[PDB]
């Protein structure tokens, strides 16, 4: 099972492609909202609970999936090139698995490979989307989902 969506942070910044494997978060006005990245959210096998739901986040219009890997021995968010013929899988590789958390009517995406690290945005305009360890501080970890047809 899969669904197409757009994700916006709690400060209402939209997510856009910034490079071949880079995403940035910025406020987009009116007609420019068509620029927001379309995500392919797949429900994968893993640790299930009332608080956490395992998901895989693909770029839908790209052969890319959000991945968590060690870069300079620090958990880092990346966009990994994949073969669309083989993806989405029911049993997805750990690095691609995210725990979808429902907070106060908002969504959180925790890394399964690196627990307590979340998909994050800066408070600042036009900064890269990254994996952040802090929850309830500098980094924004809360998101709103908008379904696309």
């Amino acid at each position, epitope marked *: 099972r899969s669904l197409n969506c757009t994700l916006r942070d709690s400060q209402q910044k939209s997510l*856009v*492609m*910034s*490079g*071949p494997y*880079e995403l*940035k978060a*910025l406020h*987009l*006005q009116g*007609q*420019d909202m*068509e*620029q*927001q*990245v*379309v995500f392919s959210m797949s429900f994968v096998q893993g640790e299930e609970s009332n608080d956490k739901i395992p998901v895989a986040l693909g770029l*839908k*219009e*790209k*052969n890319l999936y959000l991945s968590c890997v060690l870069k300079d021995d620090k958990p880092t968010l990346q966009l990994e*090139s994949v*073969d*669309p*013929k083989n993806y989405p899988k029911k049993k997805m590789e750990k690095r691609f698995v995210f725990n979808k958390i429902e907070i106060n009517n908002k969504l959180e995406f925790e890394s399964a490979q690196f627990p307590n690290w979340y998909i994050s945005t800066s408070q600042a305009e*036009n900064m890269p989307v990254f994996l952040g360890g802090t929850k309830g501080g500098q980094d924004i970890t809360d998101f709103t989902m908008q379904f696309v047809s």
Partner: antibody
Amino acid sequence: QVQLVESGGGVVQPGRSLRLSCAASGFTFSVYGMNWVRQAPAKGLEWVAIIWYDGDNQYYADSVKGRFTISRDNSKNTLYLQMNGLRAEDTAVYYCARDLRTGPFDYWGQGTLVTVSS
Amino acid sequence: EIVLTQSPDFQSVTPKEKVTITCRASQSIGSSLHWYQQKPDQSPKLLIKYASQSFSGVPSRFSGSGSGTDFTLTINSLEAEDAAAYYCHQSSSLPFTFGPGTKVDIKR
């Protein structure tokens, strides 16, 4: 609404350089990716280069990589193409093109002809 | 790079009839396949975006279909003005590539 106007096309000797520019209007230039697409006389379309909205990242076709440079000026709504080490095979109409979500080329300019010969 | 094979290179079709042109990708591109029309002495124009979505201002007679490697552009009720070149382009991965093109001849 959307308008893309190319300039700088003309004659350039093989091995020499030429700089193209594209004036954009009728949309928020600073939030859209810009591209160069070329077409040799009586031939098909070939994607040259892309520059993302903020100008931080660029990507090139294998045929132009290391010779051509794509740049933009968001304060002047202009896209540029710096073409160096030009060869006869580079003769083409060079189109300025906007992309939607780094996907389809939704708006195109009128194109500018670059003739590479002696 | 992903190689796009466009079939046929040329097609002569009776007016008011259907034209079917295929685009084949060397690797799976999902739904990131776009269609363009180029009329003589004109710049190319977007027809179909993301395999099946008609672009703003494009008539209903132009339709797109496909996923993965095989993609089709269908022109229902063929008109004289449709005598042009048609191109497929993939945006799934970099470098972006185009198919070699198809020329459509109207059989009068």
